[PDB]
Design an enzyme around this catalytic site. Structure first.
Site: not given
Ligand SMILES: NC(=O)c1c(F)cccc1F
Ligand SMILES: NC(=O)c1c(F)cccc1F
Length: 147
Positions: A43, A97, A115, A138, A141
């Site tokens: 990702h 990330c 998630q 977060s 993505h």
């Protein structure tokens, strides 16, 4: 008729039919082709000021808005789809990330670990397929299913 997750849609700028997946946010011109214990994904994460932790290896204090983060994600998707850039290259350079250092690879995982909009999109992708923008706590993505 259509596989689950997919619907027919009409382009506003060409009038041609296309197909949209409301679990992955993927969209494509061709009629879609059509679950395992585990999938493997990479990702590219873009964080924003409302991210659960608004900090990353790129930036100690992430201050961009969700709208700005989405514009970044959309621009990366354009470059990946046109072949100007590779997913792995953009993830290494620009993902917020820690997995950026592994070209965005997260390894293999089961349902119940990620998630859940990330999990749902990951398991709805076919092998090799890439998501549209996927939203979690977060950030936003782009997901590539690799296995
Ligand atoms: N790429 C996007 O921002 C998007 C859109 F414009 C409409 C529906 C879903 C989406 F992910
Ligand atoms: N797969 C991962 O989750 C990961 C990795 F393999 C290396 C660095 C950071 C990471 F998050």
């Amino acid at each position: 008729k259509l596989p689950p997750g997919w619907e027919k849609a009409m382009s506003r700028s060409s009038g041609r039919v296309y197909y949209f997946n409301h679990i992955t946010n993927a969209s494509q011109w061709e009629r879609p082709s059509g679950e395992p214990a585990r999938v493997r994904c990479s990702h590219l994460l873009v964080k924003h000021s409302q991210s659960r932790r608004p900090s990353s290896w790129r930036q100690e204090k992430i201050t961009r808005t969700k709208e700005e983060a989405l514009e970044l994600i959309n621009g990366y998707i354009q470059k990946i789809k046109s072949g100007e850039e590779d997913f792995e290259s953009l993830a290494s350079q620009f993902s917020d990330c820690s997995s950026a250092k592994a070209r965005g690879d997260l390894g293999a995982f089961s349902r119940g670990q990620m998630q859940k909009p990330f999990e749902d999109a990951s398991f709805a992708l076919r092998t090799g397929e890439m998501s549209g923008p996927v939203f979690t706590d977060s950030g936003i993505h782009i997901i590539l299913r690799t296995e």
